[PDB]
């Protein structure tokens, strides 16, 4: 749970760099 | 009804839907939240 939060963190990242 | 007369009903620790409705769906949220946020339990969870 806690690697899929980093991961859903990270694709937010992704999103808002983009 | 804290001033006031209170009946109450002793938890069971055999039914389950009990310690369920005890457990905060809220208070979770913000405590593993909090736990997340804790800079110590994310390098742990680097080393994990």
Not at chain 2, 24 to 44: A, E, I, P, R
Request: proline residues 2%; charged residues 25%; hydrophobic residues 45%.
């Amino acid at each position: 749970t806690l690697l899929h939060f980093v991961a859903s963190v990270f694709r937010g990242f992704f999103r808002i760099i983009c | 009804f804290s001033d006031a007369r209170e009946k109450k009903k002793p938890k069971k620790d055999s039914s389950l839907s009990a310690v369920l409705n005890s457990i905060d769906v809220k208070y979770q949220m913000w405590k593993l939240g909090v736990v997340f946020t804790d800079n110590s339990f994310l390098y742990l969870a680097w080393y994990m």
